[PDB]
Assembly symmetry: C4
Homo-oligomer: 462 residues x 4
């Protein structure tokens, strides 16, 4: 019909699928602690190891749909794998297979979707696509905001009303229909994109091609599955990649004429220094949100509402929507890069800094609201790196696999919070929580220096 009339049907199906994902990534780390009876140091590792599967997952979906099936059926097929992916999550037992089962089932379902969203959006224009994409990114951001503000309040509503543990699984179902919502938001308008097809679905489909794809999906389903039964295999797949991915450049650091490669490695070794700090909010900060912070969010002197145990992790698409034409105040190179590490640094100092004050037995209620603004403030302006530094065929995935490796090592950082499950009084939990955030932040200042230390070398080579 029209350009902008075409634009919603990929915006809105993203707006609902993205709404599905964050309901998982909200409580599932905080889930497997007090209900099941996991220790916690086992439990930190799981989503830790899970996340590395997920950032590398746009590569596979970057391979499949643009080359085999066509984008649109891959945009179709990437949908309702999450339909199993939470209906399997919500069957109310406690047998610990289903839990670790469907987590990897998400991955190809995530994978066949995320570089299949914007890739067609990149071809309804043919370049001020930011004027198209900043609809979409702030369509993600309006969409992702609706998510975790809601998706544990359902979990709050149940488990002192219906009687037993029939509620943790219930809130999982909220995103389950939410992806089924995103079906019908497409299904009732799936004629709009008909003039903007990819390149295989110009021609009709191939079941000779399709059966292998779902088989290699079903290969990858079980491949992503067999991890969390005895976590040592997660190490062994990294130490074959994590040696050979530094070896990816060993073919062309000093052997290969144009040393922008190692300067792209200079960005790359800097890039891994990001994501190691991120995963703490999905890990230890969630444990920090369990047995220290009071849930009596009192402004000044009055009384307000008790928080969730974990809608803290919903604050993150507030600030990347607030501080996001603010950080588009242009007039009023990758080192804007750097000083954001110091934001992450001064982020971390705060968390002992209130526990410095208000020992009450417990911590101090507030704290977090300026915490999450810090990490977001560097998070906005630093993507596009080797995707900014635009002979390719290895240069493509070289940034990707290490990025997932960078995603992995947050768990092996965060392990020091392992209070034994016998220590009950949180007068003695805080002194082991204070000994981790500061010395994480001490070296977090030291990170700032290292980009600056080689900083004037870049201005010449460009």
């Amino acid at each position: 019909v029209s350009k902008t009339h075409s634009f919603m049907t990929v915006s809105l199906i993203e707006l609902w699928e993205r709404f599905g994902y964050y309901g998982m990534q909200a409580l599932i780390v905080y889930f497997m602690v007090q209900r099941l009876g996991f220790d916690d140091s086992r439990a930190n590792l799981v989503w830790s190891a899970c996340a590395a599967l997920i950032y590398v997952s746009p590569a596979i979906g970057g391979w499949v749909g643009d080359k085999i099936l066509g984008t649109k059926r891959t945009m179709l097929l990437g949908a309702g794998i999450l339909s199993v992916g939470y209906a399997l999550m919500t069957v109310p037992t406690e047998n610990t297979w289903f839990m670790f089962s469907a987590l990897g089932v998400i991955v190809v379902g995530n994978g066949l979707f995320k570089p299949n969203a914007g890739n067609l959006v990149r071809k309804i224009y043919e370049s001020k696509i930011d004027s198209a994409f900043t609809i979409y990114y702030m369509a993600v951001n309006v969409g992702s905001t609706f998510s975790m503000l809601l998706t544990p309040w359902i979990k709050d509503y149940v488990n002192a009303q219906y009687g037993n543990e029939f509620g943790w699984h219930a809130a999982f179902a909220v995103c389950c229909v939410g992806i089924l919502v995103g079906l019908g938001n497409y299904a009732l308008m799936h004629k709009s994109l008909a003039n903007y097809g990819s390149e295989p679905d110009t021609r009709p489909v191939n079941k000779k091609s399709l059966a292998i794809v779902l088989a290699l999906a079903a290969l990858s389903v079980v491949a992503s599955a067999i991890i969390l039964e005895y976590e040592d295999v997660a190490r062994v797949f990294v130490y074959a990649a994590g040696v050979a991915v530094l070896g990816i450049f060993f073919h062309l650091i000093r052997t290969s004429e144009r040393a922008g490669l190692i300067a792209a490695l200079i960005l790359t070794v800097q890039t891994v220094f990001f994501f190691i700090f991120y995963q703490q909010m999905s890990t230890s900060l969630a444990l920090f949100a369990l047995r220290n912070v009071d849930w009596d969010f009192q402004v000044f002197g009055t009384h307000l509402w008790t928080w969730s145990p974990a809608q803290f992790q919903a604050l993150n698409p507030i600030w990347i929507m607030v501080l996001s034409p603010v950080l588009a105040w242009s007039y009023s190179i990758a080192a804007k890069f750097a000083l954001g590490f110091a934001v992450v640094a001064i982020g971390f100092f705060i968390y002992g800094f209130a526990g410095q004050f208000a020992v009450n037995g417990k911590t101090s209620s507030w704290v977090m609201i300026w915490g999450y603004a810090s990490y977001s403030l560097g998070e906005l302006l630093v993507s596009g790196l080797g995707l900014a530094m635009i002979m390719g065929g290895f240069m493509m995935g070289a940034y990707f696999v290490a990025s997932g490796i960078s995603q992995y090592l947050g768990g092996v950082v965060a392990n020091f919070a392992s209070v034994p499950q016998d220590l009950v009084d949180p007068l003695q939990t805080l002194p082991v929580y204070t000994n981790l955030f500061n010395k994480l932040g001490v070296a977090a200042v030291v990170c700032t220096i290292i980009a600056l230390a080689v900083l004037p070398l870049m201005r010449r080579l460009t």
Copy 2:
């Protein structure tokens, strides 16, 4: 005679008529509490419901004088209705008809004046009329400053000197001669504008036209009158408008080709989010100025003067005159819009924040002087909206009637201060005043996000 010699005779008659209005809007809310014996929750509603009549009132006067009588006689006729409008106010009884009588009598007297002031000023130029209007607006602002700084000090001077309640009515008479002043400021110079007539008073007047106008005025006088005898009718006129005014766009949100209409609704639904916060200074803050704040305005350690109970509401044309070429510091789109909500937000936090400290029995004397600067700081730069976004015949008044509806809902916000009239000790009043301003301000931060959440959508459509 001359252009600038013509310019005073509309400036000065505005400068005196505007001087009349604020004497009413100063104490009349604080009037009907401790003298009559109203509760207070009845009393908040009255000026609350009165104000909605007044912002819609330039529309009717925008219809009458430019089309029927001519501007000048409408500029004449809009004057001395206030002459009854305060001489009726000042007759010293306590029978509660006169009070609610003349309040609506103001309205057409206000109505036939405010878009008849500047409309001729718009035609002594034929466009840097801001270089004409910023005389006028700061002629309003020099004029409006003289007002409420004075108009309750008269009320102070009486009621412990002359003996009884013969003083509340006395200060009302100060503006009564003040409008009679504005007669003679015109009447001794009413030959100057003779070359700048409208379009009916090019021709001679029509009593065949005039008698209906004053009849429809006298219709509207009683129509505006019959409200405050049993306040439920004020609801019922809103719920016929407030449904049909959202229905005004229902003819042309999704039916009507050019979606700037709903983006003008995006400004509009944002616009209503303003005025709901305004009316608190004309309502609850005045009650907050009665039985908490000490009147011992002590700078640092010395002694100064006891305040009025309500010249606080005079501070508002100070700051919109101070901060008003400051906010014309240009080089050193409607989202400048937005962050002013955060000013209104951080405005409100202060009021418990001093009561947080100086519990003395009572509150803490100071407080307010930085309070009123906040609301003004957003108030300067946000008008001109659909009057900035310039097929019209419904688009005109659609912003207006909802704006008065937006004016209305402040009273149904502010009702929570209803202390029963038996509770005397203000040690127990403050804990019910602290429970309202914070959670008004809590969501006042939440307002800031919502313009930002859809903010990048505007830059494309223009």
Copy 3:
């Protein structure tokens, strides 16, 4: 010889004559309190009334030397009247004629000099004379700095060594040779300016002209003298000027076509609002520096040096030399004017604000160092007014005589510090000093509004 070689001989003779003047204006107010046995309220008035003679005094010298004798002999004759002007000051008795005698003897000696300095400097160029004058002004400022930092330390050195009161007169002699220094700094180089003569001393001198000039000087000497014997005559000369100088514009406010005159009066009535606040540092602050401030200038915790009782008034050519290419940070109308009043305002609040804290019996040692920076910060950028707004013959002196009238009214402001001379314990002096500086500063904020209140009227008329 050369341009710049000519430039010193008027720079340096200014640099020494200006060095002479400030030695007087340093302690002479603080002189006539504890030695003689004056009360203090008599003593405040004297330099108060003296100062008004002095700012009007460039007008008379603006008349004499450029028209009668020639600049150079008037530059000569304006010198060593101060030679009597301090040798008369230093004769060691206590008879109170000499004191009030030579104060007015300064005036014509000041008068025949200050507009005779730069007027020739204006004609060694024939216009980037600021590149000439900012040598000179910062030659004044390097010169004036050497002054009062030294000229009471001599007074410190004597009066507990030589035995009696033979020292107050001694420090007066320091500037006495200092003007005799400025003789020889000219006298050993008085051939340099020989090619840059005025216009009478092109021709030879006239004793027929000269004898009247010194007679009218000797008329003006006794005329300036007969003031301080019974101070009521000082009123009566103002109330003939101060009525007729407002009457100077009464010929041409509303009678005289071009209303920049009253806008120049708008600057003028604003201009008088300056100087009323200035004279406090030459008056009450000096009394505030007598019997409150401890002289134990302790940085942090150690020990430093005891101050003078009055080198505080030497701080003022420090800051107008520090903050003076700072305030020439241009890119990184007279309302820059205005906000400097708020600097003067926030200046004054400090003085009770430390006495708020450190009641020790006495005040708090520090205080002043940020005080004097405030008054200077507005003092730099506000001269040149009607001398900026460039049919003249009355427009010239109209700003001048009111400026001296503005100089006068500081004394009738500062009178409220009149502690009776019997009250010894400074525990009870501070509560009458706190009651004056705040309410001076309360209205000092109110001054800021008044320029802003008419501020947009100026941008049109220019």
Copy 4:
């Protein structure tokens, strides 16, 4: 081979030789206090007097290598004199000849190197050599950072493990192989610079020239040696220079047509005002780091690592690498010069300011980390002076010799910390340390005024 391929072999040999030097200038002042049994006031003077030899030392090496031997062999010969220069330092006795011996042996070894580094770098370009040099300067700065962070931790590792004093000499050997490292970093690549020779080593070498050079070196070795045996000779060589170097301009202040010379002296007398404040970090602050500061670097509440007694002096190439494209924020004359003195001033106030608080017996652990940032903040932007103000043959070294004289007078400033070696309890050391840093800083503000006091004179003469 290539330009940038040539660029390392002078970068890296600088990067290792500079790495050698700072290992000495780190602990050698703190060395001769508690081990040997020196008082301290003798010990301050030694490196104090040593430093003056070192800044003048680029002049001699600016004479030798570019004119006699050729740069490259002078770049060769300037290396391994430090090889003796620390192997002599490390022979484990306590006879106090070796200590004062090899300190001057450094000097010609430093001298034949520092203007022989960049001088060839100035001729691999032939002018955006800053785009070459900011590699090098931040190659110095990446190199110099590796230094003192490490070179007393070796000294920590020994002297409570191996038993006795066999460790102070051990850490000296760390730089000894480090210069031997810088041999092989050249020696394994000494064919790269072969096309970029100086001008003597175009031709073959001369042993008829060489033997005098090493003899005049061996003259200068003993000449620099005979100082510290009885320190009065160090005075007598200054008072022959320090009179005649002010006499260097006495030939051409007022005798010599172009007064930029004295304005270059205006920079010069300002320039000496720098370096007097510097040497305190190499002197008294090191003593301040001995017997006041606790070594329990506790962030907030936890526990971290005990410091060194002197890696504080390693902080200085952190900040001049952090704050060094920050201070290259250009758009967002020598008076940028000036306000950095106020940074040095507000630097010094801090050191009593924490001892003001946390008297514990001892001082307060933290303190220093914001201290060293201050001195660096002026240190970046102020070099290049008479090397910026570009008839030479005396104008060259005139800035140099006074700069070393300026280097000298820090020791005669810092002498006031001479606690007698008997006073043990550091409750009584701090009150003599507080009495020095403040009144050093009191006049440090006074320095700021003096450039400003003559500041507008410069803008005309250029």
